[PDB]
Amino acid sequence: MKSITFEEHYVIEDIQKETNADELSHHDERIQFMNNQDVQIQVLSYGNGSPSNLVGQKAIELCQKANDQLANYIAQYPNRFVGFATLPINEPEAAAREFERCINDLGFKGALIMGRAQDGFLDQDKYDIIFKTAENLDVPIYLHPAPVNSDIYQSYYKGNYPEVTAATFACFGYGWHIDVGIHAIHLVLSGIFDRYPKLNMIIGHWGEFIPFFLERMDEALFAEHLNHSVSYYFKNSFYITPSGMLTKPQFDLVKKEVGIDRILYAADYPYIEPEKLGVFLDELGLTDEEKEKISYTNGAKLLGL
Template identity: 40%
Template sequence: MKLITIEEHFESELITNEMNKIAGNAISGQVSAEMLEYMKTDLPSDEEMQSTEKRLAFMDKHKIDRQVVSYGNMCPQNLPPNISIDLCRRANDELAKLVQAHPERFSGFAVLPVGSPKDAAQELKRTVEELDFKGVLLKGNYDHKYFDDPFFFPIFEMAQELDVPVYFHPSFIPNTITQQYFESDQWSDVVTGIFSSAGFGWHMDVGIQVIRMVVSGIFDKLPNLKIISGHWGELMPIFLDRMDDMLAPRTTLKRKISEYYQDNVYITPSGILHARELRFILDVMGPDHIIYSIDYPYVKPENAGTFLDELDLDTETKEKIAYKNAEKLLRLK
């Protein structure tokens, strides 16, 4: 069975070096020293992020036919516009080199200078029309603004016009939120760092962001806009009925929150390959709105290529999740 994975990350040596010159380590100052030490030992090296050979070897080992690749932590999205406009363009050109070198194995999601939404919209248009990118991945938020803010509307308007999806990806949350929700003298700073990031906090934060998009009414304005949410929906699908009961009646929305979510959002596992999560998401979203992803090289599960085969699902459902939904949404050849 063919496999296409769509949340797979990449870094360019050129762009990483540029970012370090401009801003120092792009992660420093956002997390504790203990968390930085953990990240140095547990997260992939620059070489692994940048190596095409290692990437292809992983794909071949797990029989992954295609990755849709996007930038990882060294992402120029949130730099000031006077820097990010040019650097995002260069970053997209660097990613395009990978795609063009192996067009049968890789596709790309753009990185955008979101601090200037009109420029970001034009860069999205360029990457789709000239570089054949398949959408955009947005990390976290910008300048403490979530992407439902009307400031960012031109980006989503362009995504609908081009008929490409927007992938919402987690990033580091504000230190004030970390201190309020995740910090305690009962555990170490390393535990706090993980609890506030990949252990829970990232997912809460970006899940709220997707729901904010719904509640803002953007899908009434842009009914054909498509959103992708990783990590099995970032905690939100279990609360759709609750939000329909308690939240939706107090809004000006034309439909239930669950209806927008089930129509306009696509879910991926991001390498969290557990059957019970998939069964739940299948029940909530149906087989047409689930797309496979691994989160390489941050996650490299040993069952990356066998997870779907081992499940008690009909062949058509497996094929939709494995590749058919991705081919349809992203118009992959």
């Protein structure tokens, strides 16, 4: 059974010099992984050091270059890849125009945004245009982690242990996942999904802790200004992926909280190269219908394939 994978990364060497298997030129290594793991399509997004974290004209020009080079690559292998836009978030009106260009000119099927803006989370009024654009284009936004701000690193992650421990704790060990979950909650609480009810967002790492507390948020997080309960937005406007963390207890929690229709597959290639990607869905006690949904059908519907 073939899959569509949603959190698969690339970088461009020349863009990296300005800002190894992640390099877009490493085509054969990418295809070997996909073929061996029964992956039909990788949805490609910029990886480490994305130009989306830069400011002004430089951020604009480097995102345009990344998107153009990605589109040239997909045009060579159109049956195996779909593109997600890289946006200069620190320039929101320019980001919304680049989003439109990616969808309408480049044939991309959404955007992946790493971290947050230089001035905070994307619930701020100035970023509303990005979400409005995504709904208008009928495409999702994948909200991905990135390094936390220095004030969070110093308050929460530095402690009585080595610096390498503090850095990994702040990043992929825990911290940047806590951060992206909080960012996604800001988006819900700000009413983005009441303004743009057809908008869908995607989050990785089994929901960035959010599914652990859905029932508790409905009971304890006061949000009477929204049209729906807090949990409703995660069940109806979000999709969740594993990001190559192929662990059953988290899958079971996510299935009970959001349901099978909201789960998409993802490997986090090449930062994770999960050897069990092609067999994991067979170890969860799922029906063939459920396996088909997670592997390809939920994603094919979302991407309009």
